[PDB]
């Protein structure tokens with residue numbers, strides 16, 4: 278487990294956007310970020326899907342998170358632009374971006390993976406991720422201390438049979454993070470890094486018993502770390518949660 | 520250093536090898552080298568006129584008439600890839616080698632300024648098309664006694680660098696694709712999959728990527744062929760999943 282304990286006000290005055298916030302790891306990140314003082318912006322397919330996590334953040338005592346609905350599989354460049362303008366309109370600032378959303382697609386050998394499935398996984402996991410980062414980079418580059426975290430996987434770092442487009446999309450994600458990190462270095466106050474969450478007790482991981490994995494809630498040290506002031510200067514890193 | 524392999528003039532006798540982006544540069548050099556080492560070559564490129572020179576060169580060296588296939592990577596669908604495979608199957612009944620050489624660079628701007636559609640088109644051409652072509656040809660490659668797929672990569676597909684736009688990203692995906700497929704092919708087929716970083720060459724694509732570099736600094740693509748020949752011939756049987764360098 279990554280070793281870091283966050284102060285209850287670690288992220289105060291910071292605005293952080295989380296994609297895939299409805300369930301699983303994204304949901305735990307939205308909650309933990311809100312619990313540590315950050316104003317959180319939640320991305321998901323429908324308001325309905327973000328209602329429970331939002332009710333949780335509100336029950337805990339934080340103001341209604343900003344909810345933005347987007348179909349990552351469909352969303353156009355213009356939609357990401359409109360999303361960024363919403364964050365600008367509300368906050369004038371973005372300090373954090375957690376790229377958590379992605380789909381696995383079929384787990385079949387490449388020879389059997391339909392072309393349309395390969396394309397859709399690449400679009401959701403890579404294209405949408407790029408378009409979202411591009412739209413938000415002006416806002417992040419205004420911040421005094423901003424952080425971008427991409428989610429990867431062991432199969433994004435060493436290719437394994439029957440992971441279809443998922444492993445390939447996670448390689449692409451690492452290459453995107455490394456490219457971005459090299460552009461940000463020194464000349465901006467933005468950092469870019471990847472997080473391998475490892476095995477978690479989520480619907481998504483239950484892929485690959487389940488009792489052997491921690492709750493996503495419990496893999497939050499590295500997530501809190503990258504979004505707060507203690508990771509200033511840490512850039513271009515592929516890190517592990519566990 | 521230059522990959523250490525010398526290829527005997529009949530090294531590739533008995534082999535049918537498809538080369539993408541065959542019209543010029545590294546693709547043309549590989550097509551010419553494979554034919555010169557005894558292979559039957561299938562030339563893939565955008566237009567007949569673009570492929571005439573390389574086809575003519577191969578015929579004249581006496582090697583003889585290669586198969587020419589036209590395809591538009593930005594908009595070819597499974598129908599086009601299926602028909603390509605059917606043509607290869609009709610003529611040869613198999614494929615012994617597949618050199619994925621075609622790719623595009625896109626803009627080399629910072630990511631912040633990289634237009635969305637340019638990013639997606641680079642990803643489509645360099646990755647989606649490479650996958651669909653691979654998938655259409657795998658059954659043919661599997662009919663070979665000893666088959667080899669080589670993906671083209673780049674130093675920036677292995678360690679990311681500023682202002683490579685979608686190009687570095689696409690080559691990271693390429694290495695991912697190669698590794699995944701190698702793991703699926705290993706021990707249960709006679710097909711290997713590896714990647715090649717060609718390094719710097721004296722081509723129009725290198726000049727596009729480095730607008731201020733003088734091409735005189737770079738070797739001719741025909742001089743970087745040792746790894747290209749190695750991977751396609753029997754001396755590389757059992758080499759699978761590896762990220763190799765031409766230079």
Ligand SMILES: [Cl-]
Pocket residue numbers: 543544721722723724
């Ligand atoms: Cl050229």
Ligand code: NA
Pocket residue numbers: 298299300325326327328329330331
């Ligand atoms: Na929810």
Ligand code: NA
Pocket residue numbers: 392393597598
């Ligand atoms: Na199709």
Ligand code: NA
Pocket residue numbers: 625626636637638640641
């Ligand atoms: Na383009």
Ligand code: NA
Pocket residue numbers: 392597600601650651652654655
């Ligand atoms: Na196909």
